[PDB]
C-alpha cells in the first residue's frame, strides 16, 4: 500500500527530472527523496562518466559545495553548545594571526555571528572593490582564484590568500556572500576544539552515519567517483579543468551521495521537531542538537538576501522562507528551508519541507515529519531549487 | 537466427547514438538502417517535442535539407533519360527569364551540369564577393535570407532573389556550394516537363513508395511533426524561430521519415547494382534508372570538394569516396556514397555502403546488396557522417 | 583450422600475462598480437578504472611513451625522403633560436643524426652534471620536471626549459638517453615542413590508419580513457598525480590502443621486407618507406647502449638485436626490434620479430612475414620486454 | 527460489572482494559465508600458489592466527564448565614453574581472567619497556622473535622465552595485547586437563566437525596447502621466509579452511541463541556450551580496546560491538562479534552477525539465526573487517 | 491468444478513426472489421443523434449509397447465372418503354454490360451537356434532383425523369458515372424476374443473412435509425433537409449496419476463393456464386476510371486495384477491391483485401482468407478509402 500510493508522484518527479535535464543538457543527474524520515525513491539518469560509459547510480559521488558550509555551521553549533565557543567575542581571541582591521579609520571588530550571515564584509573572489560597490549600489537603486592548483597543508596557511585584503564594507552593515569567511570559521573551529578540522568533521559524519562523505583529494582512491563537464564556446561537451580545493574544504571542498544528504536532512528535521513532541511522549530519543539551538538556527536575519529565492531571507547558513498570508484567497507561502550549492562542473541542492502540525497530529505520530529532497548534477551553473520544491510539493500532496 | 546474429551490432549502434546525442546535447534523435534491402532496426531516443512531452518515434517527421537536392537530381536524371532535357545546352533555352551574364567582360554560359556540381559560380547566402574571394584564396593557399518569412507562389518568382546578382567566379572554374542553383534547376524542371514541380515530385514519391515525404507548409496538418531547438547565448534550450522555406523546396524545403530515406537508398542501390547481375539471371526486374545513368551519377568530378569528408569528391549531388589502396598494410579506403544535410534547428544524414562483389557471390545472390543508414536529428549544426559510417561498418562486419 | 592451430599458444600467452600481472600487481593489462600481418588475438585483464569498476578492453586507451619517439623518427625519415631535411647540417640552420654551444672551449656542432641516437650530449631530467658524470664513469669502470603542470602553447616555447643548459658531454662521444632532444627534433620538423607538428602527425596517423592515436589533452573528451595507479609507501594502491605533457609530445605525450600499434608494426615490417620480394612479383604495392630508408633504420649504431636488453644496441629510435652465432650448439641469437616506453603511472612495449626467409619461401609467399606483439599496462616501472619476447617466440613456434 | 533470491547479494559480495583484492594487490583470496546455519556461497579468486599456477579453491588451507586464540578460549570455557578450572585462583596453583612477580615492590597475582582479556601486563614481542610506556602514554594523551626458527617439544619449554621478563604494567590496570599469555593459557590447559594440548584441541575439532583444522608442521603432508607472499622494497612479489610456530600454537599456530570457520561460527551462534528458544520448543538439541557461559562470553570488558573497530570493546577473546542508539534519526549501531587475525604472509577474519529476534519470530523459527562471514587471504597486513561487515549487511538486507 | 495478438492493431485503428473524425469534424462514426471470415472488432464513436444524446453503437443504421449498386450487380449476376438474362441483348427487349435513341444520327444500342460499367452515356444529375463535355475534354487534355421529395410508386415510373434525355456520348465510348443507369437495371431486373425488385432484394438479404438491411422509408418504424448533419455557411452544425429516395433504391436508397456489410464481403470473398480450394478438399460448401462468375466480376474494364483511387480501374460495380510491380525495390501494389458511397448527410466505405495464397497455405487452410473493413459515417463528403486501406494493412501485418 505504501508503494501503491506512492506510484503517481514518482512518475511526475521523474518527468520533472527529465524536463530539467533536457532543458540544461546535463549528461547525468541523481535524485534522492525521503518521506517522514524514511527513504522512498532513489534514481539516476544519464551517464556519470561519458568517456567510460558509466551510468548514473544512486551511489554515485559528486561535489556538494555549500553543503560543506552547512556542515561547518552544524559543527560550530555543536561547539557552541559545549560552551567552548562564544559568538560575539572578536575572532582575534581565537586566531591572533588575523590582523586587526579598521574601516574608514574607525576601529571595528568582526564576530562569528557576522561571518555566519556573511555580514563581516570579507571580499569574495572579485578583487576590484569599485566594481563590487557599483554593483551593490545599482542593486540597491533598482530595489528602491577559482581555478587554483596549489595544495594547502593546513587551514592556517589558507588565510594567506585574504589576510591582507581590506574589508569592502563596514561589518554588520551590508550582506556580501563570501567563502573565505568559512575558511576563517574552520580556523576558529581548529583553534577552539584543539583538534584538526578534518578529524572533527569525520567524527561528526560517523555520528550522523554519513559514511560516504569525504573531502576532495586526488591521490586517495574513492569508489564511484564521477566526472564533471562544461560546454565550450562551440556548444560541444568538454571536460572540466583539474582544480584543487584544499583551501575551500569548509567552502565547498566535499563530496557526498544523495543518501548522506537525506540522512543529514532527516537528522536536522528531527532535531527541530523534537522540542514539540516532548509533552506527548517521554520515550523519544533526544535530538542531535538542543531544540533551542535549532530554533536559533533557521531564523531569518534582517538585511540578508536569499539569492535563489526572492521570497526568503538568509538564515544561519541556510535559506528559510517563512509562512506568509496577506490577502484572502491569494498566494499562501509555505515554510521550508533549502540551500543551493554550485561548484565548478557540478551543481547540487538540498531542500527541507517541514509538515504543518496541529494539536491532534502530535498526539499519535512520530516526531520526524516532513519531506526531504536532494538532487545532484554534474553540470555547472544549474538551478535545481524550483524542481526540488515542485517534487517536494508533489510528494506532500500525494502523501496518503 | 537473423535477429540472433543481429544482436551485437545493434547494441554498439545504440551506444554510438547515445554517445553522439550526449556529446551534442540534442533533445532527440531517430535512426533507421536497412541491410541488403531489408529493414532490420529502427529506434528513437529523447523527446520529439519537449513542451508536450512527446517521445521520439520511428514515424517522427523532421527536415531533411540536402535530401531535397538529391531528389531533384533524381528527377533531373529521369527527365534526361526521356530525352526532354539536354545538359550542355545553355539554360536560357528553357528559362528565358534568366538574363545572360558576362564574366570579366567575356561572354559565358552556364549549363545544367555546372549547376549540379556547383560550378556555375552562383553566389551563396553570403553577399560580399570580396569576403568570399578572400576566403577561397586563403583556402587555396593553405591547401598548397536564411530566416526569410515571405511565401513564394511559384518557383519562377523565387528567381527574383538572385536573378540580378553577378556571378562570383567564371563558370566551371571553381567549386562553390550554393542553393539558388537548385532553385534554377527546379525552374528548368518545371519548364521542360510542362507540369508543376511539386506534382512531379509527388508522382516520383508515389512511384518510390515514399508516402510520408512532403514539402514544408504550415497551414496543412501533418501528423507526427516534430519541433526544432537551438541553444542560446546562455546555454539554455530555446525554440527555433519560425521560417518559410517556399523558395528552398529543391534546396531543403522537404520533410520525411527514416523509412522513406531507407527506401530511396535501397532503390538507388538496386539501380546501381542491377547492371551487373543481368548476365546471371534474366528474371530480375529492371531498375528505376538505367545502369548507364547510375554509372554517370556517383562519379567524382574533378575540382570539386566534399565538405564532410576530405577523402572524397563531390559527385552529381552526392558525396562519393572511391576505393583506394596505395601502400601495403596501410589504410584501405572503402567505397561509399553519402550526403549530409543541415537546416535550421535540425540535422540529417543519409549514407550508402555498397558491398564488394566477386565473381562467385553474384552467381547465387540477389542484386541489391549493401547497407543503408539514415539518421535524423532535431538540433542544428550536427555532424552525423562519422557515426553513420561507423554504424554501417559495424553492421557490415557483423553480417553473418 | 587457423584458430584450431592457434589454440595452444594463446593459452600460454595468457598464462604468462597472468604471471607478470601477479608479479607486479598491476590493476589491469591489455595485450594485442598480429601474425603475418593479420591480428589473431586481443585480450584484456583486470580493471581499467578501479573506482568506476570499468573492466579492461582491447579498445582501452593508455599512454605509450617512447612510441611517440618512434613515430617522430618515422616522420623525420618521411621528411628526409622528400629532400627537405639534411641530417648532417647543423640544427641552427633550421632553428636559429637554439644558441651555439661550445664544449671545453671548442667549437662543436650538433646534427639530427646525433639527436636521433642520443649522442648530442643534451642533458636528461637530472640537473647535476657531476652526478651524471660520476655515474657514467662508474658504469664504464664496471664494464671494463617530470611532474610539470604548465601547458605550452607551441613547441618553440618548450625549448626554454633546456636552451640555456650547457652540454654534458662532447657531441657524438658518449651515449646519453634524453627526451629534450626529441623536442628539438619536433621543432626541426615544424621548421622544415612549414606546418604544425600535430597536424603532420595526424596526417601520418590517418595515412597509417591509426585513428585512435591522439595526444594527451585534458579538456577534449576521449572515449575509453583509462586511469593510472601507483603504490605508496604503505603498499596501498593510490591514484597518479595529475601532470601535463604538452612539452613531451614527441617524447611521450601520446595515447593509443593495441590495434594502432599492431598496424604500425605491420606497416614497418612490410616496408622492411618489400625490398626483397620485388624480384618475385611486380604486383606488390610499394611500401610506406623506401627499402633503402628501412635498411638505414634498424641499423645498430656503435657506442650506443640498449637499456632493456644487454645483447642489443640502440638503432635509430629502436632497439635492435642482431642475429649472432659464435660457438657450436651454443646460444643462437634471434633478430628482432623492440622499444620499451615507461611513463608516469603506465608502462608499454612494442616488439617486432621478423621471420627468417630462405630462397624458397619468398617464391610463393606474401612480403609481410613476422610476429608483432604489443602490451600496454597502467602501472609504472614495469618491464614487459621479456614477456613480449616469450609470447612472440611461442607464436613463432606454434605457427602451423 | 533460495538461489534466485540470493542472486544479487552474491554479485555485490564478489564485487567487494575484487575491490579489496585489487586495492591490496593480494595474489589470492577465499571467501565463505553461511546464512541461518546453512552455507550458501563459497568462492576463491586468484592463485593459491603463483609458482605452480595453482588456482584458489574453497578447500585451500591457510593460516588463521587469532582463531587459535578463540579456540583456546573455547577450550578454557569447556574446562571451566566441568569445574576443573577456577578463574580467580592464581596461575601458580596450576603452573608452579612460573615464578611469582612483584610490581613496584608490591605483591601482585595474575589470574586466567586477566590473561584472557590481556590485562595481566605480560609483554608483547616488543622488548623495550620505555618505548611501550611512551606509546601508551601518548595514546592516552591523544584520547584525552616473530621470525623464530627453533622447534619447541612441549608447551612448558615455550615459557622460557618470557618467564624471566618483568611485567610491564600492574595486572588488571592497562590493556596490553599479547600472545605469550595464550601460551601460558595453553600450559594451564595442559596442567588442568592432564592431557596434551594438541590432543584436547583435536578432540574438540572432531566434536565440532572441524576436520581440516590442524597445527602448522612442515614434516607432515597437508593437502591443498597454500603459500604466502610479501612485497619487497622494490614493490615486487617475493616469498615469505620460512618460520616456525611451535611456540605460537595457541597464539596463531593453526591452519584451517573457510568451511571449518563457518561451522565454528554456526556452533557458537547456536550456543548463544539456544537459551532463548527453550520456552518455545523442548525438542531442540542442547548447545555445545551452556547459555550462561555464552552470555559470560561476548560480554564487553571495561578498560579494553578493540583494535580493528573503535566502536567496540574487547570481550573474552572476541571483539563485540554492542547495539547503541543515542539520537533520533542518527547512526544506529548493530550488534555483532568478530575477530581479525594477522600472521606473517597471511591475513584472515571471522565475523558473526546475530539477527534481531522479536517475540513473534521465535514462535515458529529454528534457534540458529544469523549470518556468518569468513575471509582468508595470503597477504600480510590486510584489514578485512570492513569488507566482511559489508558482505554480512548485504546478505542480511537481501535475505528474503 | 487471438485477442492478445489482436491488441496492438486495434489501438492503431482506433487512433486512425479518431484522427479522421477530428479532421472532418463528423459527429459520429462506426467501424466494423472481420478477419478470415470472423468478426474481431466493432466500435462506434461520437453521438448518432446529437439532439437526443444517443451515442453511436455497432447496431446503428445509416445510409450506404453505392452498396445498393453493388447489391444490384449481385442480383443481376444471380439472374444471369440462371440464364434468364442476356447481357449483350438491347434493353428494349426487356423494357419496351425505353425509346430507341440515336447518337449523331446513327443507330446505336445500349446493353446491360455498358450500363454496369457506366459506358452507356446516360446523363448524371448535371443537365447541361456543354458543361459536361467541356469538363471531360479538360480532364482528357490534363491527362495527356438530388433533393427530390416526390415518392415513386413503381420503378417503371422512375424512368420518367430521364427517359426523354438524349445521350451525352456514344455508348461504350467514354466513361461517365451515373445513377439512372442503375434505375434502368432495376427495371430490367423486375421485367426479367417477373417479381418486384424489393421482394427479390429482400430474398437475397435473407439468403445472405443481412437482416438489418432495408430500404429508406419514412413511415415504417426502423430501430436504431441515426440522423445526418451538414455544416452551414457559418461553420455551425445543422440538420440535413428531408429528402425522398424512392427513385434511387438501386442507386443509394438503402440502409444497413456494419455487420451486414461484413457478412456480404465475407460471402463475396468466399465465392471468389472457393474455386481454388476445390482440389484440396471436396467437403467445402459451394459458394453463393460460381467461381467463373466471380472471376468475371472484379475484372478491370478498359477506358474506365476509379474515382477514389487513381491506381485502379472500375470493375463491374466495384473498384479493383490489380497487383503490380515494375521496378526493383520500388512500390509494390497490393490487390484489393473496394467501393465508396456518398449520400446526402452521410458517407460510407466497404473494402475487401484478399490474402496472397501460395501452394502450401491452401493445403491446410479454410477457403475464406482475407480482411474485410467497413466504415460508416453520418457526415457528407467524406473520403474514408485511405483510412480503411490503412486499417486493413495494419490488421494484415498484425495477423499472427
Residue numbers in the entry:
A (entry chain A), B (entry chain C), C (entry chain B), D (entry chain E), E (entry chain F): 99 to 242, 291 to 546
Give the published text.
In mitochondria, the serine beta-lactamase-like protein (LACTB), which is localized in mitochondrial IMS, functions as a tumor suppressor by regulating the PE biosynthetic pathway. LACTB is a conserved mammalian active-site serine protease present in all vertebrates. The conserved catalytic serine residue within the 164SXXK167 motif plays an important role in the enzymatic activity of LACTB and is reversibly acylated through substrate binding. Mammalian LACTB is localized in the mitochondrial intermembrane space (IMS), where it assembles into filaments to regulate the efficiency of essential metabolic processes.
To examine the molecular architecture of human LACTB, we purified near full-length LACTB (residues 97 to 547) lacking the N-terminal targeting sequence. A final cryoEM reconstruction of the LACTB filament was obtained at an overall resolution of 3.1 Å with an imposed helical symmetry. Further analysis of the structural data revealed that the basic building blocks of LACTB are dimers, which are stacked on each other and assembled into filaments with a helical twist of 48.25° and a rise of 21.63 Å. LACTB has a globular structure with approximate dimensions of 60 Å × 55 Å × 45 Å and consists of a five-stranded β-sheet core (β1, β2, β7, β8, and β9) surrounded by 2 short two-stranded antiparallel β-sheets (β3 - β4 and β5 - β6) and 10 α-helices (α1 - α10). Our 3.1 Å map also enabled the identification of the amino acid motifs (164SISK167, 323YST325, and 485HTG487) that contribute to the formation of the catalytic site, including the catalytic S164 residue, all of which are conserved across metazoan species. The LACTB filaments assemble as stacked antiparallel dimers, where the buried surface area between the two protomers (A and B) is approximately 945 Å2. Assembly of the LACTB dimer is mediated by the combined effects of sixteen hydrogen bond interactions between E149, N150, N364, E365, P366, I368, N370, R371, N385, and T386 residues and two inter-molecular salt bridges between E149 and R371. The inspection of the inter-dimer interface shows that three assembly contacts between neighboring subunits (A and C, A and D, and B and D) bridge antiparallel LACTB homodimers and drive filament assembly. The first polymer interface, which spans a buried solvent-accessible surface area of approximately 780 Å2, is formed between the α1 helix and L3 along with the protruding L10 loop between β3 and β4 strands of protomers A and D. The filament structure also shows a second polymer interface that has symmetric contact sites between protomers A and C and B and D, which bury approximately 540 Å2 of solvent-accessible surface area.
